[PDB]
Predict the 3D structure of the following.
Amino acid sequence: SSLSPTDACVHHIKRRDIVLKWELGEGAFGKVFLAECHNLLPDKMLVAVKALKESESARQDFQREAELLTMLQHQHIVRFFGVCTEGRPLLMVFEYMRHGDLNRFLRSHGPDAGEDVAPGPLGLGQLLAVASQVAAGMVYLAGLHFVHRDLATRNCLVGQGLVVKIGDFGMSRDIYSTDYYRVGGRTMLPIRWMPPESILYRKFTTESDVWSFGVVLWEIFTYGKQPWYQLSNTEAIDCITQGRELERPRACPPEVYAIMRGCWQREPQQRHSIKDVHARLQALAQAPPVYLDVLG
Ligand SMILES: Cc1onc(-c2ccccc2)c1NC(=O)NCc1ccccc1C(F)(F)F
């Protein structure tokens, strides 16, 4: 549902092939469970199962969503294995990402907090690796002419070996309620991540995702701090619309902050494409230690 453009293709899994272990989370629209899935990939593997709460309006939304998720298959997009429409509750099966959402991962590996990562805070090299993988996922989405209306570290997942992918199970509005401004009665906007054209003109395009990516880049270098944390929602709207930009994170080199600033050009057409933003961050991620040591 987070995607905006500009039933046979959907894979099906038998309910007996899914063995629920325990809950991982919950929202107003459903629950997420860790489960064992048999005969999915050649014997048994762990998966995250999203159970849809209750209905014919939601069932067609489920069908459209599964079709969209089937289309969206790439190295930095959370893997969607298919559905179980064999009775109720309707289930969506995703790969299991051991470290959970990227916001929680960053916070737990920040100065205010060992199989996959070293002790203490994440180094410059790993923060650049995290940013580059999120940018790669957006390059793929932009390439398919898709707009992600809620790009943020809470909407990214981290797996074994610090593999980062864009994806969520629709519970961010419940889990991270303060990251949204209620305009209601049932609408919540992620204003802190939204560009001026979204707030002022209610327009959201591929260029608006470049802005949101710039905010994601800032979350990463602040170890998951909320953008404009010092401000109420209306104060945040005032800053974004007046042109006040997020300040350089302590852990962020001037070279990386230059990438954030390029994402935050008031005029959409003036912002660099996600392709160029990814190219620059990837170069920095795979740059020799000698070069990286003199940046940070
Ligand atoms: C706000 C919201 O409400 N329901 C959902 C929802 C629906 C069905 C499956 C999971 C999540 C939702 N999230 C949402 O659409 N996220 C997009 C997403 C989710 C999983 C995998 C990939 C992706 C994508 F590539 F970024 F598009």
Observations:
- The CA atoms of residues 69 and 80 lie 6 Å apart.
- The pocket of 6UH is lined by residues 1-3, 50, 65, 69, 72, 77-78, 80, 92, 148, 166-170 (CB under 6 Å).
- The longest strand covers residues 18-26.
